[PDB]
Homo-oligomer: A and B are copies of this chain.
Amino acid sequence: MKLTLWTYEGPPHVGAMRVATGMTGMHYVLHAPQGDTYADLLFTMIERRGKRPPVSYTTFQARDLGSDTAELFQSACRDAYERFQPQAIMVGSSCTAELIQDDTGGLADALSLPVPVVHLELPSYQRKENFGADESFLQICRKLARPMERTEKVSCNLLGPTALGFRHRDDILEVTRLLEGMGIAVNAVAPMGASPADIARLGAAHFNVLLYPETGESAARWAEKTLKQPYTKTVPIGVGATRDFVAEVAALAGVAPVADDSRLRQPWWSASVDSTYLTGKRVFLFGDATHVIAAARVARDEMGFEVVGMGCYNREFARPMRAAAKGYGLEALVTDDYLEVEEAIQALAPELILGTQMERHIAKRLGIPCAVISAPVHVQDFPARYSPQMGFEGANVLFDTWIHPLTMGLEEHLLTMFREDFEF
C-alpha cells in the first residue's frame, strides 16, 4: 500500500536473476508477465554484460491467464533446455504468477529434464532482491553442491559475489590476489564466475570465505553443516578490516598471516599533513549493511572522519547494523525509503554524505559533498577501471573516492574566496 518512489531493492526475482546471470550456464527460466523482461536491461547496460542474461520469461498476456500459463511454462522449460542448452536450470515466478499459482516446481518435474532443476520458492511481496539472491543461491547449493573430498591443497570458495554487484567483479580479483598471497588457493568463486560443475565442486574446499554476506550468508551457513566448512565473518573493506581478515583466514587455513601491503598508501596518504582538514568531519553513511559497517570502521578509524550519522536498508542485517551503530555512539537508521534518510541528513547536515545513488542525488539537491559506496547504482558507478573495494587496493580506492568530493569542495571554496571581494 505504501507510496514508494525509489525502492532501494528490486523484487526478489531480480536477485535470483542476478545470481543466474552471474554464473555461467544456468538458465533461470521465469513465469513472468509480458514486459517483466525489463530486468535484462540492468545486466545488459549497467553491468554491460554482453550476451543476453540466461533467463527466459514466459511473458504471458491477457490471452494467457489460466492453464495456458502452465503450458507456457512447460514450453519455456523444454525450449530453454534445447535452445539455450544449460547444465542447470532454475524455475520460479514473478509477482503475477506468484498470485496465479502454477506449481513451477511441479511443472519442471513434469518435464523431468536430465539436467538438474533447482526449484525456487521466492515470496515476491514481502522480501527483496538481496533475499531473492541469497535464497536462490542456497537452493542451488542444496541441489548441486554435495559433500566430497577436500582438495589436497588448502582451498576456499568465495561466496557472495553476484552479477550487478557493487564492484563485485573487481573485488573477487583483489581478494583472490590476497588469498593467493597468503597461500590459500581459491577453489571456486560462486556465484559470479562459477559453473554448475564448480558448484558441484564447492564442497571440496576447506573453508568458505564470505565476501558479501548479503548474498552469501545463507549459502555459507548451509555449507557449515552440509559440507563441514567454516566461513570467515570479517569482510575485508579497508585497512583494519583487511588485517583482521588476513588473520582470520590465516587461522582458518593454517598458513602464516603474511600479506603483502606494499600497495598500501592510504595509511600514509591520510596521515599526511594534507589530510588534516579531514579530521573531525561529519559523515552520513547509508546503504548496504556490510559496506556501511566497514566504511564506518574506515571513516572513524583510518581517516579521522567523525561519524555523525549511520543507516541501512538491509532489514535482514539490522542486528549487526544496530550493534555497530551503538559501537560508534550513533543510532542506526534501518529504513527503506529516501524520505527518512533525507530528513535525517537535513537535521544532521554532515559535510560528506555517502551511500546509495539517492544519497548522492539528494546530496546534490542539498549541495553537500557526495560519494558512493553501496549497492544501488547506475552505469557510471560501474567502472571499467580496476577499482576494488576490499583488500589494500580497496583501501586506496576508498580513500580517493571518499576525499574526491572533499577536494572538489575545498578547491571550489577557494575559487569563490578568490577573485571575489567587496566592490567598494
A401 neighbours in B (Cβ, 8 Å): 385
User: Is A258 at the interface (CB under 8 A from chain B)?
Assistant: no
Contact B274 A411 (CB under 8 A): no
A326 contacts chain B at the CB level, 8 A cutoff: no
Which residues 253-282 in A have Cβ within 8 Å of B in the complex?
Answer: 263, 265-266, 268-269, 272-274
Query: How far does the alpha carbon of A404 sit from the alpha carbon of B269 in the complex, in Å?
Result: 24
A385 CB contact (under 8 Å) in B274, B364, B379, B393: B393
Contact B380 A407 (CB under 8 A): yes
Contacts of A386 in B (CB 8 A): 263, 386, 393, 396-397
Chain B residues within 8 Å of A327, by CB: none
- A180 interface residue (CB < 8 Å to B): no
- How far apart are the CA atoms of A396 and B383 in the complex, in Å? 9
A407 CA / B372 CA spacing, docked (Å):
15
A384 an interface residue at 8 Å Cβ cutoff?
yes
A420, closest chain B residue (CB):
B365
A50 within 8 A of B: yes
Q: Which of A370-424 contact B (CB under 8 A)?
A: 379-380, 383-387, 393, 396-397, 399-401, 404, 407, 411, 415
Interfacial chain B residues near A415, Cβ < 8 Å: 364
A45 interface residue (CB < 8 Å to B): yes
Q: Are A48 and B274 in contact (CB under 8 A)?
A: yes
Q: Is the CB of A50 within 8 A of B268?
A: yes
Copies per complex of this chain: 2
Chain B hits for A379, CB < 8 A: 274
Q: Which residues of B contact A393 (CB under 8 A)?
A: 385-386
**Secondary structure type dominating chain A contacts:** helix
| A380 in complex: contacting residue of B50, B383, B404, CB < 8 Å | B404
In this complex, what residue of B is CB-closest to A386? B393
Cβ-defined contact, A269 with B45, below 8 A: no
Interface magnitude class on chain A: 20 to 34
Distance from A418 Cβ to chain B, minimum over Cβ atoms (Å): 11
Question: A385 and B397: CB pair below 8 A?
Answer: yes
Q: Which residues of chain B have C-beta atoms less than 8 A from A397's C-beta?
A: 385-386
Assuming the A-B contacts A45-B274, A268-B48, are A396 and B385 also in contact, with contact meaning beta carbons closer than 8 angstroms in the complex?
yes
Chain B residues closer than 8 Å to A399, beta-carbon distance: 384-385
Residue among A268, A272, A385, A404 facing the most chain B CB atoms (10 A cut-off): A385
Residues of B within 8 A of A45 (CB): 273-274
Q: In the complex, A401 Cα to B401 Cα: how many Å?
A: 13
Please measure, in the bound complex, the distance between the C-alpha atom of A268 and the C-alpha atom of B47, giving whole angstroms.
Answer: 12
Complex CA–CA separation, A268 to B384 (angstroms): 9
Residue of B nearest to A398 (CB): B385
Bound-state CA distance A397–B48 (Å) is 17
Encode contact with B along A262-305: 1 for CB under 8 Å, 0 otherwise: 01011011001110000000000000000000000000000000
On chain B, the residues within 8 Å of A265 by CB distance are: 384-385
Identity of the chain B residue whose Cβ is nearest the Cβ of A397 in the assembled complex: B385
Nearest neighbor of A361 in chain B, beta-carbon distance: B415
Q: Which residue of B lies closest to A387 (CB)?
A: B385
Interface residues of A in 232-259 (CB under 8 A from B): none
Q: For the complex, give the distance between the alpha carbons of A415 and B361 in Å.
A: 10
A258–B380 CA distance with the chains assembled, in angstroms? 31
Could you tell me if B274 and A384 are in contact, using CB atoms closer than 8 angstroms?
Answer: no
Q: How long is the Cα–Cα vector from A401 to B385 in the complex, in angstroms? A: 9
Enumerate 9 A-B pairs (CB-CB under 8 Å) in ascending A order: A45-B274, A48-B269, A265-B384, A266-B384, A364-B415, A380-B404, A380-B407, A380-B411, A383-B396
Chain A residues packing against B (C-beta within 8 Å): 45, 48, 50, 263, 265-266, 268-269, 272-274, 364, 379-380, 383-387, 393, 396-397, 399-401, 404, 407, 411, 415
What 3 pairs across the A-B complex have the smallest Cβ distances? A265-B384, A385-B400, A269-B384
